[PDB]
Design a protein around this ligand. Sequence first.
Ligand SMILES: Cc1cc2nc3c(=O)[nH]c(=O)nc-3n(C[C@H](O)[C@H](O)[C@H](O)COP(=O)(O)O)c2cc1C
Lengths: 163, 830, 182
Amino acid sequence: IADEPVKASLLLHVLVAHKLKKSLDSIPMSKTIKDLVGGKSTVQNEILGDLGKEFGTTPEKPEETPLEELAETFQDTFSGALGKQSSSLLSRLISSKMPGGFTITVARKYLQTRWGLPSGRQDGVLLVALSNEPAARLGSEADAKAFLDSMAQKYASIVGVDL
Amino acid sequence: STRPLTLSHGSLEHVLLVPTASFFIASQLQEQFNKILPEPTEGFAADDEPTTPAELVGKFLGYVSSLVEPSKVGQFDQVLNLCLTEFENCYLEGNDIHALAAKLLQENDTTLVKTKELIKNYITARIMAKRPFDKKSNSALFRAVGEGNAQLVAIFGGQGNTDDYFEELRDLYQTYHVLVGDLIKFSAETLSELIRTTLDAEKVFTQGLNILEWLENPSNTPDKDYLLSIPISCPLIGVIQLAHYVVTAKLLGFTPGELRSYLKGATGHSQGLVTAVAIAETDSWESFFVSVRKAITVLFFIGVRCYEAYPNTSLPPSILEDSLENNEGVPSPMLSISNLTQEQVQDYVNKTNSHLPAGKQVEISLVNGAKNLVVSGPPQSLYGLNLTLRKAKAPSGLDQSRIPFSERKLKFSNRFLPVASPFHSHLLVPASDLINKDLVKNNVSFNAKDIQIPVYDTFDGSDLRVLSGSISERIVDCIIRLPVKWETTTQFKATHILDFGPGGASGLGVLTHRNKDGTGVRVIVAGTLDINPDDDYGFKQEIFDVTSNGLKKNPNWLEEYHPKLIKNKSGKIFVETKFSKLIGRPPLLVPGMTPCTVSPDFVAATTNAGYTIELAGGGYFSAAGMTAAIDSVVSQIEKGSTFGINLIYVNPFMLQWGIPLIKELRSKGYPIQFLTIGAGVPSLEVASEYIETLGLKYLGLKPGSIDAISQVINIAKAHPNFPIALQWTGGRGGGHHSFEDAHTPMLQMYSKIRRHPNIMLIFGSGFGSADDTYPYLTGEWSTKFDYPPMPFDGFLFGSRVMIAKEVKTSPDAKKCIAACTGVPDDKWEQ
Amino acid sequence: GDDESKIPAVEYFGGESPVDSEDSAVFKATSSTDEESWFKALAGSEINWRHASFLCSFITQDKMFVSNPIRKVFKPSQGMVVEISNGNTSSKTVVTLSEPVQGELKPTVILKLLKENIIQMEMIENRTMDGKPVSLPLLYNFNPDNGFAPISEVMEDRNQRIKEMYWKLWIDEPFNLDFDPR
Ligand SMILES: Cc1cc2nc3c(=O)[nH]c(=O)nc-3n(C[C@H](O)[C@H](O)[C@H](O)COP(=O)(O)O)c2cc1C
């Protein structure tokens, strides 16, 4: 499997999907953040603070831009880098759902071994984990590996690479 | 003699020298707190788990304070005063818990949840050991207020700031249950007595209003309807505004009379006007629980009598599904129309009111900004308005960039309000008399002599003290009859503004900021803790922070960008702007024109008249071709005189020979002052090459659209020290032009441009005389659109100079340029 | 209010990036001396010929803009000591640099107004054939009417002076350059 830098349209999509508390199919990219959030501006202004913590610079009023036009604008000055917010979002996802003790390195080598998926795939794989967060802590290790199989199968379906 | 006790969580540790006489109880506390302490995780990014050693001491402080009795001084008070003193001698180097919690959030992997847990645990532990904040905290703000540098006003939020007000009231009762405990039970006993007293209340309040029950147990909390219903929504917003006000005053260690005395004035929005008079009267902590009982009784009686007047009305599921299918929000008698003029919204109201009788009319209830209006009527006649409005709104996925500005479809966000009564609507008018009778029957009256600082009316903006009639009559009449004019009431002069309203980050504070940005009013969002990334409005931390970085005001664009006059030894008078200071010639340039500025005569004849002109790259095709022209310029002009070069950014071949040609002419000391990239803006990497390699004095740029301006700012960020001349040109310019109105993009971006001081913002496209430039030199041009003055550094004159004597333009073309009449801005798009 | 007198006055108007009292001072050059604070402290606060001299980053030769030699020479290195005499009126103000010459401290660079419209960065060498120190008068025009580059080096006979210095250093004859090379 060929290693590429993480796609900044999937990253943005995971942020908005996990942020509202929605799944990946419910929210299409052909929709502005103001439309999907509805009324609540308390969400909006700190979504605009979260996008500014990920990519840094944002366009003028990225509130009323479709997420194709916004993701495409991030491609200009993005290169594979999870940065601060998504790296901490995956740090509070593992330490809440993965069984106490499960480390990121475990999953990473596991993705490298079973699937052959390098670091540029594993960033986008971990973004699919967060966005479709499981309800309760998966105490059973096998249950955590049976979730990591189903989410790596959503990652392999979305990207379009056979696994 | 002391004995060391460590408290650790994996890698992070803290050592606390516990007295050996009572050490064997601190290891009894240490085991039981380290049981409460979870399993360690990498990054410490788990919630209910400390990230810092500071947050571990603050979690211990809160664990020990949870067991201490404020009556029975048990053994755990003599172990809090030694770990809270080390808190003060390890972390709190003067500043409060809030200004260092602001350090934690922005610097370490710290979240708002566990920061507000640390604030709660420290604040419970400080007041738990019987150590109330009694001293006068010397915040640089208040120091400046004492010295007279700073002036404060206390704004107060109304309805519709948030979807759920009750969550700010739950967060106040979560963080500050030790301090607010007095106000909550007092208000619960005033309302639960009124209910058995005032008739029909018991009917108005079904699930009752014993708020104590629903704040002890969040589980029983009813829907945000019984809560959203104004007989409950009003009083609990009355409560939360005082709860912010008292929590501020306590933390500071001032009496409500002292905090009131400091403020220049106070004001509220809609039904927040009662809180402003409730804090203006108050003098002492004892004389507070009479201002509380007044405020609560008023808001109760407005709520009850307005809900009995125009009631909530059931709505067909056929209207509700269509309204939430267009994302216009859940229908309610208040509708917010963002990003439109007042006249537009009143037009559309008149059009909808055409089909409706007098009893069902919709009417403009509020004006909460320049373009942020609220309308009120029956939900069905508001839907009827919304039907017309969705027929004007452009699709959100549309690109209009390739369409003329006059042909463009206006873009705006209409939404319904999280509220259950039409405030400032004629529908509630039959309640005014009943409210006034129920106030006088309980003897609630605000006396004009009792109010200490001025308090600004929502409708007309006048002081409430100078009122001839009843103050409690005027407040009601302002809430239920009169349309709030928020840009009229906030006409006071101040340095800071304090937002005690509910909402915080999306509160009334930020609304008033955007309404008043660039008048030098550093507004403070006093209702929440967080860091402003761009740092244009403050939060809770700079209320208390006892430093020099407490006084850091906002900018006043008319002042620091006021054009001056200055004079050299020769008695030559110069206009002094950010730009003319750098180049040492008037801030008037002649921009590279193909073919008007191709001629090496017209570049030298403009330079020898003491002005800055670009040589036009467009007219030359080879490094030799330009080099001859440059040399001819250099031979013609006087000694020390300069000029610049204009390179189009759509001709990659030109750039390819050009950029080297300048680079090596700079290396040979050729008098090339600056390079102006026209027809597009280079990327950060291309611009970073051009700025660091070609050894210019500043880089000209002609950004096309708003997006281009965004990129120009991003280059000005990357290279803060290097001067950039953003040469903004409207669509109404001559030659290769865009579809944009010259004004609007500035009215959006001008703030963001002026944040980076290196950018000499040079206006142009339209001008050919001093008269029409004068408004844009001064900054008064922007007063017409209802903005603060936004003055520009300098100008550029394309078309005006094309009929000058030293321009090579043929003598018959000059008669053809002259003959052209031309047209005012408005007509240019034809 | 239509009163030209109210208008501020300076020397030359220009060269001020948009990002931004002692008469007899002595500045010791340290290894870790900040170059900008140093040059500002040499320039002082008042905008005069001397201020141009230490803060302009380009001087004029003929029509060509070369890197400011005055800043290059006075670049702080360890052992340098600068004095500013008469540093309250420009007209009289002098800037003497001394450095460790053969171990001992000796005067090297005398920067002063030779005339109201002429600078002279009198350069001095001590290491000579006879011992008397050799002197090079590098002249410059201070024109405040050009607010961008008010310092234009006097190119008239600049080679004649430089040679005339090097003559006294190398040759042990009377200075004369009007002979046939052939
Ligand atoms: C004859 C003519 C030639 C121009 N050539 C150029 C050019 O080569 N590059 C460029 O960026 N802008 C060019 N412009 C645009 C001008 O730089 C400037 O934006 C415009 O003339 C100012 O508007 P005004 O004509 O209304 O004063 C040209 C304009 C005119 C009228």
